[PDB]
């Protein structure tokens, strides 16, 4: 127990954007919580970046507007920040910093983790196995997500992600809670992904970590922390399925530049901080299945490349970590195609050991590397039909053509309330697959091709 | 002896009081045990390095001081163990805290020092014997293989006094006791090595036997020696590349991947079998590992590196062959740059500090055949494989080419087939392979047919290169008809041959008879292709290479199936008995169109 | 007159799901806040000054 | 057959309006008996400050445990009026403690210009010289510390423990 009575503060030697410098603080400890009183009686919180000696560097999470040196007191709490979780934060609406905005009562603690994650031995996880049937056919036929994956969702400003991410959402099953965390959206995506979960009827099992876009920033950096350790909670101590959805992590990371301009650092790719890789890794690595807890969190974040930039430092440096990606494009969105999936840069790392004989089906594997490269060479022939015009082309590049007109309308385009099944999206696959004379599937082998594909 | 915090920010612990430590020694930062380098001194303050994060140490904590370096414990007990990057037992800890996860600050021993190894000396010696660095006197059966040869230390020699019986000795019961100018120092089986420091040798011997690999491309392609080092799903070639080697000891260590492509690696290496004279074991007899994510701080990601490097040169100098996999060379530049960003360190290129073409070279020329030092007559080798991993998919990023002046075999992938799947590539501007002419002794014996056929498969697809550019401008209408062809064998070897599905059962490991195999079908296809057009050329019956397309649909399936042969479940001469059908009936396919 | 007719119909078993968990959790706060009220008072009165870091 | 449609979606609404209501009614109602734990703990030690040597020993820890959290050569206690009899017989009892510990001088004295509130029911507020850093050891900020440290055990006491937590006790 903390027993000692704390030592509250009036030694501000210094404000400097969103940072407070402290002096005369007696043995700082590093990632401290303060309590800042402003002058007028307000109160912000705020957490110690450095200690050095006899001062400390407190990073206020509401920002610093206001504080001055003479009257702004700081109660060192003496302690990590901790957040209170149970089971019965499961069916409310928490705003970016853990406080209620439901028109409810504070959370009543059973235990109080630590939220910047403690880490788990890789030598005792389990590796996802298990297939998630999303019914979405573009991301369960040829992209499939197990349960422990981390999945991103890029996408850019205006195209349906949160639409495409809802949707998983109602039909996320196999072949369950969700812990829903906003940051920086605007008040109209909020309004959505209340609304959807209030209609399905399944408030009951949404935690909502809701920080809008006047909601203040540096609160960012600890909401997607207070989001993944209740799921910790409840995936490891309450052995839940726990499917976990962080909307804009683009604005993770400019809360995270912004915090480290000000402190200045050494600053990294496109002004972006040092310390970037291993920050989105202390966020996206909490997910998977461990041995002796029949819990597991599943990950999907969404991005947002701006100027639909796939090599950007936030797309580029989340591919490093999480496990495949789901790329949401802007020329299909033009075309009235939902969901606007490119196959092409999409990617699941854990599809490989997820599918086959004795989980799902016996041609899984092949079926989807086989539209892999159909849908890859007609989008070649595509740029060859600009140059030579549309009548040099052969009797056999007519056909993948064909493939693009019945792809991207058939199997791609699916409509908000389709819950395709697993079989649903491979039996698609096979009427695409016979467009072809049998003699062109040259990445499928002839003990499936003499069972599957004369129908 | 002892020390105080002064200041922390983030991994970068300031301590005061620390007025005679050294450079890059270790340590014990806080209440609880974290350890720590050192990396800097300014008058009496030492600047201190963390492998641990620092969250919650406060000014006034003890910094206790070690005396020694970084270093490894080199024993038995090393084979089948799964470590971090400064080296703690993930396997012991996930038993004796009884816990999933992993304390802070936590100390156990690398080497377990309960369990009983048995002991039988070398016979060449015998109490009063001069024993120098390097000199076997002892050897282990550590398992049913690898005979682990305890070796005197380097910087180590004198007169034998004592030296134990053959029995049952745990790694701390002291066997050997030499006899110097006046000092006597007692000695045990496990000895302990600075992970920045190069294991001594006494000669370094040129490489020239083919270190064999699972993939078609960088086995006829690009080749490489037993001590070459080389450079590349990037995490999918790494790993199933590390499976399938003809090595002696795998060191497979991962610098930074993803978690559950961690409990992949700690899975599937288990269950992997591995034949020897009759019987068939487990691999993970032969193999240790380095377990290092992302999750984990960016100070142990840096020295999981050296803790790799470092046991793949104490099982060389047993007189071992191994073959270390060093994985995402580039996450490992990515904790150098994140490390020197905390320094204020003036970076030169990229963010990337102006070392880097020196932690990456202090990395790859450790490797190489080696004539090992001591007198019972060894010889060992390392073979290093990296694993490149460039930002953004552009290959001008300073760990690219800072690594193609070091390394000796080099293979990328391609520049349009980056972010789209077509695995592998091979990108003519930047691949090669030095150890091109250093293996035309062994291909002339055992294979005798392969150079000849190399030649014209790199002949194919240095012309498609050319001709593909001027097909994306005129549109194959300034095509004479043999050259129609050359743009579609090109099209089947790089879909086909060099494109190879590394995790399908029948496709991890491709043995060598079977890429010559597949290689002398496709170029004995093209000679009879050019000879079906340039021989009915000027006067009629033009076989165009339309014509050959739409009679001989069927065998250029046969051709894309050249690949879905399994060489377990098939024969070896079963799969050379459904090849050579395959040409008779590609000869019997040009004898209906003349 | 089915739609409104089975709402207020289940908004009375809405009603009496809570008031039966009202008074059970608050049946069971009655038997032991005194085995709280000895230990929380018992630990404010149980005060111990030390000096940790020197 | 649209408008059809808009009322059974509308009623999955009204269903879970009703039902999210349902549970921030149980919630508010066991935070009010939390409430009142605290507010009947409160006057249980409002009969602590009574009996004038249970208090007295109170005041002893009390004002010499903000003695070991501040380590300053000036020191200054603000407390009641009421029980200024009593600090003065509490300060000075820590002194050979506080001396004989940490090897150091001190000089400590209370506030005669601005007292406590008389409603602050006990405790002290130890200052330093130039007042501007404090410890505030009343007996509402030691229940308001060891309270919100010990809602896990009150909750596993008052209202059952969770049944689906399995791990980590």
């Known amino acids: 127990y903390l027993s000692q009575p704390r030592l509250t503060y009036k030694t501000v030697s210094g404000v400097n954007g969103p940072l407070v410098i402290l002096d005369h603080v007696k043995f700082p400890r590093y990632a401290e919580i303060v309590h800042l009183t402003l002058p007028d009686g307000t109160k912000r919180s705020g957490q110690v970046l450095e200690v050095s000696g006899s001062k400390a560097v407190v990073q206020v999470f509401e920002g610093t507007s206001g504080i001055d040196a003479k009257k702004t007191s700081c109660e060192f709490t003496g302690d990590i920040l901790r957040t209170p979780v149970s089971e019965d934060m499961l069916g409310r609406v928490f705003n970016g910093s853990g406080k209620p905005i439901d028109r409810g009562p504070v959370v009543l603690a059973e235990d109080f983790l630590d939220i910047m994650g403690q880490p788990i031995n890789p030598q005792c996880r389990i590796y996802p196995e298990e297939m998630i ?11 499939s997500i197990a349960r422990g994956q981390k999945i991103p969702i890029f996408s850019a400003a205006g195209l349906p992600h949160n639409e495409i991410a809802a949707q998983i959402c109602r039909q996320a099953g196999l072949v369950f809670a969700i812990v829903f965390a906003a940051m920086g959206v ?25 920080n809008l876009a006047n909601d203040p920033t540096i609160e960012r950096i600890i909401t997607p922390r207070l989001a993944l350790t209740t799921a910790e909670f409840l995936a490891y101590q309450c052995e839940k399925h726990v499917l976990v959805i962080l909307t804009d992590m683009s604005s993770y990371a400019e809360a995270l530049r912004e915090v480290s301009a000000a402190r200045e650092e050494v600053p990294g790719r496109r002004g972006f901080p040092g310390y970037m890789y291993t920050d989105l890794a202390t966020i996206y690595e909490r997910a998977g299945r461990v041995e002796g807890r029949n819990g597991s969190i599943t990950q999907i974040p969404i991005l947002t490349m701006p100027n639909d930039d796939i090599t950007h430092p936030i797309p ?16 299909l969105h033009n075309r009235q195609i939902y969901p606007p999936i490119n196959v092409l840069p999409s990617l699941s790392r854990l599809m490989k050991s997820a599918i086959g004989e004795g989980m799902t089906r016996k041609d899984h594997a092949d079926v989807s590397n086989q539209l892999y490269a159909c849908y890859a060479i007609g989008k070649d022939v595509q740029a060859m039909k600009a140059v030579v015009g549309e009548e040099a082309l052969t009797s056999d590049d007519l056909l993948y053509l064909e493939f693009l007109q019945k792809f991207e309308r058939n199997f791609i385009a699916q409509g908000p309330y389709e819950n395709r099944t697993v079989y649903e999206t491979l039996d698609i696959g096979w009427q695409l697959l016979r467009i072809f004379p049998k003699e062109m599937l040259k990445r499928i082998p002839q003990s499936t091709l003499s069972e599957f594909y004369p129908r | 002896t002892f020390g105080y915090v002064h200041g922390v920010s983030g991994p970068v612990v300031t301590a005061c009081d620390m007025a005679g430590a050294a450079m890059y020694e270790l340590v014990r930062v806080g209440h609880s045990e974290l350890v720590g380098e050192i990396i800097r001194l300014e008058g009496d303050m030492a600047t201190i390095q963390v492998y641990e994060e620092t969250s919650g140490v406060s000014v006034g904590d ?34 004796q805290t009884q816990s999933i996860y992993i304390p802070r600050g936590v100390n156990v021993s690398a080497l377990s020092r309960d369990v009983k190894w048995d002991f039988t000396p070398c016979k060449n010696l015998r109490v009063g014997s001069h024993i120098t660095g390097g000199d076997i006197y002892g050897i282990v059966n550590e398992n049913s293989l690898i005979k682990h040869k305890i070796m005197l230390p380097p910087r180590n020699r004198g007169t034998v006094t004592y030296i134990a019986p053959p029995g049952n000795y745990d790694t701390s019961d002291v066997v050997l006791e030499l006899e110097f100018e006046g000092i006597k120092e007692k000695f045990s089986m496990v000895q302990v090595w600075p992970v920045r420091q190069v294991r001594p040798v006494t000669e370094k011997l040129p490489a020239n036997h083919p270190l064999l690999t699972g993939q078609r491309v960088l086995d006829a392609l690009f080749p490489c020696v037993q001590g070459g080092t080389t450079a590349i799903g990037k995490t999918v ?12 000891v795998i060191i497979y260590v991962g610098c930074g991947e993803r978690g559950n492509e961690m409990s992949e690696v700690l899975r599937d290496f288990p269950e992997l079998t591995m034949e020897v004279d009759g019987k068939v074991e487990s691999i993970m007899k032969r193999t240790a590992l380095v377990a290092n994510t992302s999750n984990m701080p960016v100070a142990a990601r840096e020295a999981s590196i050296y803790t790799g490097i470092t046991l793949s040169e104490y099982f060389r100098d047993m007189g071992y062959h191994v073959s270390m996999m060093a994985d995402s060379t580039s996450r490992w530049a990515e904790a150098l740059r994140e490390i020197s960003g905390r320094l204020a360190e003036m970076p030169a290129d990229s963010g990337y500090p102006a070392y880097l073409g020196a932690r990456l070279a202090s990395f790859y020329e450790r490797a190489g055949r080696v004539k090992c030092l001591g007198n019972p007559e060894r010889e060992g080798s390392v073979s290093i494989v990296g694993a490149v991993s460039p930002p953004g998919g552009d290959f001008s990023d300073p760990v ?84 129609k062809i050359t743009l579609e064998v090109a099209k089947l070897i790089k879909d086909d041959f060099l494109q190879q599905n590394g995790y399908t059962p029948y496709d991890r490991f491709c043995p060598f008879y079977k890429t010559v195999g597949m290689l002398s079908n496709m170029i004995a296809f093209y000679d009879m292709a050019r000879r079906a057009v340039e021989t009915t050329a000027q006067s009629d019956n033009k076989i165009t290479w339309s014509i050959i397309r739409e009679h001989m649909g069927e065998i250029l399936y046969k051709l894309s199936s050249m690949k879905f042969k399994d060489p377990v479940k098939d024969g070896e001469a079963k799969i050379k008995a459904d090849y050579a059908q395959l040409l008779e009936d590609m000869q019997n396919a040009f004898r209906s169109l003349e | 007159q089915a739609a409104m007719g089975s709402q207020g119909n289940l908004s009375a078993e809405v009603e009496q799901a809570t008031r039966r968990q009202v008074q059970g959790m608050q049946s069971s706060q009655q038997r032991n806040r005194e085995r709280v009220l000895a230990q929380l008072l018992g630990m404010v009165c149980d005060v111990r000054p030390q000096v940790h870091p020197n | 057959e649209k408008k059809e449609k808009q009322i059974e979606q509308q009623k999955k609404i009204q269903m879970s309006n009703l ?16 409430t009142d734990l605290l507010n009947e703990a409160k006057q249980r030690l409002s009969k602590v400050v009574k009996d004038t040597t249970r208090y007295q020993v109170l005041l002893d820890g009390l004002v010499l445990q903000g003695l070991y959290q501040l ?29 004989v510990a940490t090897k150091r001088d001190v000089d400590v004295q209370i506030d005669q210009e601005a007292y406590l509130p008389e409603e602050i029911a006990g405790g002290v507020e130890i200052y330093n010289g130039d007042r501007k850093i404090k410890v505030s050891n009343t007996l509402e900020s030691r229940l308001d510390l060891i309270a919100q440290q010990m809602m896990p055990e009150v909750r596993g006491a008052l209202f059952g423990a969770n049944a689906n937590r399995k791990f980590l006790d």
């Open chain 1, 133 to 143: 049937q999303t019914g979405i056919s573009a991301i369960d036929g040829m992209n």
């Open chain 1, 316 to 331: 580029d440096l989340t591919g490093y970590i999480t496990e495949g990606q789901i790329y949401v494009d802007r020329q």
């Open chain 2, 62 to 95: 003890p910094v206790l001081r070690t005396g020694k370096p970084l270093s490894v414990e080199l024993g038995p007990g090393i084979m089948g163990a799964i470590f971090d990057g400064i080296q703690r037992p993930l396997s012991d800890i996930s038993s």
């Open chain 4, 19 to 34: 039902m999210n209501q349902a549970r921030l009614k149980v919630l508010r109602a066991r935070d009010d008996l939390i």
């Open chain 2, 400 to 483: 690219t080419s800072a690594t193609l002046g070091i390394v000796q075999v080099f293979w990328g992938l391609d520049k349009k087939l980056a972010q789209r799947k077509h695995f592998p590539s091979v990108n003519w501007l930047i691949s090669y392979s030095k150890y091109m002419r250093a293996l035309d002794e062994y291909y002339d014996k055992h294979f005798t047919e392969f150079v000849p056929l190399r030649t014209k498969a790199k002949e194919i697809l240095q012309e498609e290169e050319d001709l593909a550019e001027i097909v994306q401008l005129v549109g194959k209408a300034s095509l004479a008809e043999t050259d």
């Open chain 2, 237 to 248: 070639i790494s790993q199933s590349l590390s499976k399938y080697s003809n090595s002696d």
């Open chain 1, 186 to 210: 605007n008040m109209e995506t909020a309004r959505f992904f209340k609304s959807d979960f209030e209609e399905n009827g399944s408030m009951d099992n949404v935690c909502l970590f809701l």
């Open chain 4, 71 to 99: 380590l300053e050569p000036r020191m200054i206690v603000r407390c009641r009026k009421q029980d200024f009899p009593l600090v003065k017989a509490a300060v000075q009892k820590a002194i050979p403690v506080y001396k």
